[PDB]
């Protein structure tokens, strides 16, 4: 039944990560439409600091969320 929860808990993570990728893209278009830059360095550090509670792996999760949000650099 703990295995049954992890299944649900993964479905919810997957859904929120999908939603974050949309909302992040939307902020990107909005900032660029207003004459701003796709990437903003200070904001990426805020996302990284936000996941630090997960430990050393927190920053890797953050960077992955930023990659789903904007895209690969240079592309």
């Amino acid at each position: 039944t703990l295995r049954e929860e992890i299944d649900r808990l993964d479905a919810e993570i997957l859904a929120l990560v999908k939603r974050r990728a949309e909302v992040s893209k939307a902020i990107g278009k909005a900032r660029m439409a207003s004459g701003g830059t796709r990437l903003v360095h200070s904001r990426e550090m805020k996302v990284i600091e936000r996941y630090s509670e997960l430990g050393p792996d927190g920053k890797d999760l953050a960077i992955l969320l930023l990659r789903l949000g904007r895209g690969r650099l240079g592309h």
């Binding site: 004459g35 701003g36 830059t37 796709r38 990437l39 903003v40 360095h41 200070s42 990426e44 550090m45 990284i48 600091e49 630090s52 920053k59 890797d60 960077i63 690969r72 650099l73 240079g74 592309h75």
Partner: protein, 416 residues
């Protein structure tokens, strides 16, 4: 306090004719000192040991040919302006270290060789849009021309600064050569500095994964039996803006070039570039670049047309030698995506192979984000066209050393 100095075979006839014709053309942004005093100083410089030698320039050309063909990446960087005052071993060592650090990161990200070209041993002159500055003084034009002190006497153009520039340049180059053949140029010692940076920077967490991956790559090299002695000695080339034609012409020397015939080499540097304010198509600087054997660059700003870019390519790379010419894009982050593609397409259709290099400083929302956005836009332009994003040209002062390192990490990501 002053040092006192008490004041040659002929060029082939055609080279003399061509050199004379180039220097008779109008030259923008030149010092306004007396011709007789300039001649005395050029006469001194005509017999001094050169800063660089032809064999190194020919080797640079070969390595730059690989960049032009999509098989290497060009890193150019260092001080925005060198000063005599800061021409010290700690300052020079700091610049060599930063460039080596950036180069190791960029090599890993590019998965190809990085050519390292410092703004060093000669970056002593700058153009100014206005001759009178905000304090009402004649503008500071760099230490090859006048003094930074905010007083009229210090701002007068002083031709003795040509000789001082050479003394400073050759002293710095000597140290650069010593440093690059020492154990501290070792890749693993160089990347330990990158790892210290990741530990102590407030933005370090952003770069730690990549710095660790690089370190594992280095340790892997070593585990496979690669020692430092087995590698190529680190090569840092010298460059500066070819601005002051009195200096550049005094540092010309004749030598057999890549095709065997005698050629003029500017031995003040390995490579030089011509800036936005001195790149007049029928002016002395472009004509001068046409007579020298060195690899050259031209800065292209937001008013560049595809047709003028092609004209530069045809005048400066007339023999279609890959790597001889670099086109240095500095459009501003808001303009590069729109203005660069037509230029690239037209130049690529010529069959010439230039190096496309990004200068994200001079055309430019916080300042760091604009600098990164231009390089990002530059990579997008080239990805869309199928062309090679060939290199970057950065300045440290504004971008500080820590920021220039961060930018290397970000560009290494773009290169993936």
């Amino acid at each position: 306090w002053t040092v006192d100095i008490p004041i040659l075979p002929p060029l082939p006839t055609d080279l003399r004719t061509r050199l004379d014709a180039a220097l008779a053309k109008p030259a923008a942004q030149q010092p306004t000192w007396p011709a007789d005093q300039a001649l005395a100083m050029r006469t001194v410089l005509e017999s001094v040991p050169p800063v660089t030698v032809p064999s190194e320039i020919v080797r640079l050309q070969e390595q730059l040919a690989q960049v032009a063909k999509g098989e290497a990446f060009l890193l150019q960087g260092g001080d925005c302006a060198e000063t005599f005052m800061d021409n010290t071993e700690p300052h020079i060592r700091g610049n060599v270290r930063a460039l080596l650090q950036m180069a190791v990161v960029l090599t890993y990200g590019a998965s190809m060789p990085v050519v390292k070209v410092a703004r060093i041993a000669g970056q002593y002159a700058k153009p100014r849009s206005a001759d009178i500055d905000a304090l009402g003084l004649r503008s500071y034009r760099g230490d090859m021309i006048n003094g930074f002190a905010p007083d009229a006497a210090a701002r007068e153009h002083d031709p003795s600064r040509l000789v001082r520039a050479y003394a400073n340049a050759s002293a710095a180059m000597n140290l650069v050569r010593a440093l690059t053949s020492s154990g501290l140029a070792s890749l693993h010692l160089v990347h330990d500095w990158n790892r210290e940076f990741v530990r102590t920077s407030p933005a370090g967490a952003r770069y730690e994964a990549l710095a660790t991956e690089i370190d594992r790559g280095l340790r892997f090299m070593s585990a496979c039996g690669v020692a430092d002695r087995n590698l190529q000695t680190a090569e840092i080339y010298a460059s500066h803006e070819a601005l002051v034609l009195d200096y550049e012409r005094a540092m010309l020397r004749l030598s057999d070039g890549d095709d065997g015939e005698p050629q003029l080499f500017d031995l003040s540097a390995h490579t030089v570039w011509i800036g936005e304010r001195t790149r007049q198509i029928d002016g002395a600087h472009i004509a001068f670049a046409q007579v020298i054997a060195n690899p050259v660059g031209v800065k292209l700003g937001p008013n560049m047309t595809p047709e003028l870019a092609v004209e530069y390519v045809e005048r400066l790379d007339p023999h279609n030698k890959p790597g001889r010419l670099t086109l240095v894009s500095r459009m501003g982050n808001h303009k590069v995506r729109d203005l660069l593609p037509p230029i690239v397409e037209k130049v690529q259709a010529t069959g010439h192979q230039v190096i496309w290099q990004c200068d994200p400083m001079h055309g430019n929302t916080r300042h760091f984000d604009r600098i990164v956005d231009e390089v990002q836009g530059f990579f997008e332009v080239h990805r869309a066209l199928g062309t090679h994003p060939g290199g970057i040209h950065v300045e440290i002062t504004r971008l500080n050393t820590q920021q220039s390192l961060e930018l290397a990490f970000l560009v290494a990501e773009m290169l993936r």
